[PDB]
Symmetry: D4
């Protein structure tokens, strides 16, 4: 019942995107916490969060941010846990700024980066699930059921 | 002694980049295999590789490709294992095509994407290690030692 | 009456774009099938589809996808038939990701790529028609009639 | 012995790229002609070339150009034959201008566009072959042999 | 009363942009014609138009197009008159494709390129006016009056 | 013998590009001056140059600049003469910054923009010539001869 | 009560963006003037404004512009005061043109550039405040209060 | 004699760029310190550096970083001092990732961003000087002398 994934984001408006990650973890019954942590406005909150993540029992952190998106990278700077990054779509540059500022981490501190926007949020949750499935065979079966339903549910022909 | 990470790439020329992942896993004492699998020229080889990866005891797959880089995404389509993608730098577009064709996966099938080029290959090995560290406390200690040494090795002032 | 062109797409929402290809083939009376095949969610459906395409009497495949758009390329990996690719406009990056992930095929496995969006869908159908016109003189005459009407119908002066 | 494919390019400097298409057609025993036609410096030469191509027995045209690359699109404006476009890599913008000015044809006049540079030239010859293979079962067998050999030649592991 | 500027565009929908050029020439009392000429759908109409432009008394041609925008360049290929190009904003790529396919003319055949969209249309008309002002002192005075009013009319402080 | 075109550039390093415009005007026997004027380091020099250009008998100004390239736009702000802009290729962004900062003038003050680099410089001289040819039938004949020779010099086939 | 910051912009429509700078300075009780100055339409107004800025007691200039955005750079060309630049979002290219034409100043004349759009306007005001805080300890305390409230006000968890 | 500007960078390889800022501050007789601080490998070093900067008597911070360049933004998160950011040119993306990850700060925490590469480093030192000149009339006189000499040194015509 204690969280094994932390979903964090810089602001309330990021939640429109990150709620898709939150929903997916819930559907797969992965205990998690969903929090606002701003790299730029609450840097000490972030330092404390990432530094204590492991010892609190978190296994994976999903971090979402837009623009000059620094939250995932700085989070990875302070934890050895895998950090997954979701570029939030920005108004002017449509998440191209978010994408580059998250994915282009220099060697030594990784961030596993997902697609811009809602698809990325969903896939960060699914990637976290595939990571946790390595430790948890019940979850591994639920994830397989999910992928099997995803595959079987694709229609054969489009509708008008 | 059996591999727990698979490093795959479309061609020999990709190895100039992916060798950095290979070396880093060796440095961390993570048993792995390093193979050529082409999404476009050996699509059946890829299907079999990805499909059987879990049952062969693989935990993580690192896939590198450039240009219309489809190896990581298609690998993830056939395995429930976590798949990490390395955009290989391309001649004309300098890995921007590689990057977008790997990271922009629609929701449902993730690829955790790292930086373009050698940095990404290195960080894919480290992200893979941080995943395996959740299962293996000895590796977790090696990774923490790696990170601590990285931090301690940064000098305080530049040389002129 | 048996299909000689297959139009395939990853999802129902791609059909808003790909229906323009479907309409054009119908207007030119080119027998075709219009299907959903997802590279990422139904990779085995795709392998079977492309592998058997030729022997089923298909002559050309038109494949549409968005984002990390892998459907056309993987389809070309499994058939010697000409494969035409339509980049579907994506939400954030407006099909620039779709375009690069389709057009930048390395040498050995081609995809003939058309414009992003509806114009590309229409032109993939027209390109398939110009290919089939090489085998079928009645179609060749209908295609010439189409191009002649297209040319003659352009007005000389704009309206307010 | 008469050409069934025309390879055209705006300048001698384009041949460094387009020679790969020329060589591949020769490898597949496809009779072809290889010519310079400049959209901007010889627009009447282009009009006559494209307009008479079909009646001269050409089945496919491969056109390469760079920068504001107009040769393929204008060629397609005057022939009902399938026109394949190769973006030639440009100095400053590295073929991104070439690519967009070829692929983004509005609906009504297609150009099947290949990758920037040598890969695209090679794949234009292969796409042209896959088109002609629909008319010519001997060529179809050569193409299938080409593809089979390509697949078989991929090694299983990289060299260090 | 005979036209000294020709404004041409590929389609009716370009007129939403090019009408700003038409309006400006009218405001400055520059006799002009405003026409639809499609590079891709009416290439012979274009050849005839550009070839005869000079002898018909045209002094400047303003050409607008979007996407793979070939109209200005091909027009310049057939006339020694100055050709001004207006990139029309395209749906997906917002005129970035239009811009590159117009401005990146290789040396030998120029197109003087203006901004994407309505601003470019207005400025193509103003640039044509500054060209014609070199021959016509009454126009030169009207153009100076225009620039003087433009300058004097800028407010000093913004409004809420 | 007095100059009718002014070629201006921000620095000596720009001349590697702008010399092509200078040489072409000389080839066409167009009297001109070639000067350094920096928008950023000599803004008063620019104001005086542009402001007095018309009264000194200049008909056209060719301005080259790179990076945040402001010389052409600011020159046009102070003269009613036609101003042609040459984006000089920049180190990091390869003239894309130069290009956008010159071509994207808001409506009211035009700059006729040419290709990035040497091609643009050459085409600015040719566009300037085509403008002056409207005033000068001898130059018009030289330009027509230039264009005819260009067309005749294109070979029919490439060399291997 | 005399202004110590000047906020300038090229047009009324820029005010939708620049009003955020105006509001922030007011909130921090920084005396300022908010003005329209167009680089392209009122270049002499700009020369006079920047040249006299220092002697009028201005300490910082915040300049906003879109498209080929020349206002900040030219302003910096005529004053030794720090000039902060706000790229205004443009219709087609979404401020990517504004950004490059402001930030890529060559060495010798700086512009401190902020984010595209409203965020940039707000931050230009905050950056001006942090500059003025070096001279004014009461302001420095108000700025600290602002940053402290900004930090403390970030919620811990998102809302549905 | 105590430093009033801090120049910080993530690595030795950044100094090739940041040395230009260091040299320029020395040329203007501005006491400063030049240090390595890595946002990703020494995040606690960064927190302490930025947090204590003001109390140590620093007035301005110049921070350089490349790729996912987080050093300037995170530095600004912990200090109320003005922070100036220099995008260091990256291998693949040529500083476009560096640029966007520095300049696109959301509202609330500014970074005054300079040009990619050496020009930006030089202009960060000059912008820092123009800030300190507000506090120090002797420096203000040196800066005005620097600017006057820059202006006077521009030659009137290029060398061939």
């Amino acid at each position: 019942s204690a969280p094994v994934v932390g979903i964090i984001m810089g602001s309330q408006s990021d939640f429109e995107t990150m709620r898709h990650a939150d929903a997916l973890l819930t559907e797969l019954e992965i205990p998690h916490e969903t929090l606002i942590v701003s790299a730029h406005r609450t840097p000490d909150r972030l330092a404390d969060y990432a530094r204590t993540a492991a010892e609190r029992g978190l296994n994976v952190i999903i971090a979402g941010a837009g623009g000059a998106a620094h939250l995932p990278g700085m989070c990875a700077a302070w934890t050895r846990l895998p950090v997954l990054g979701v570029p939030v779509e920005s108004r002017a540059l449509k998440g191209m700024d978010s994408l580059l500022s998250i994915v282009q981490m220099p060697g030594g501190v990784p961030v596993g980066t997902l697609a811009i926007g809602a698809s990325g949020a969903k896939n960060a949750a699914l990637l976290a699930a595939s990571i946790l499935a390595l430790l948890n065979p019940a979850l591994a079966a639920r994830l397989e059921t999910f992928r099997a339903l995803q595959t079987a549910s694709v229609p054969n022909s489009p509708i008008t």
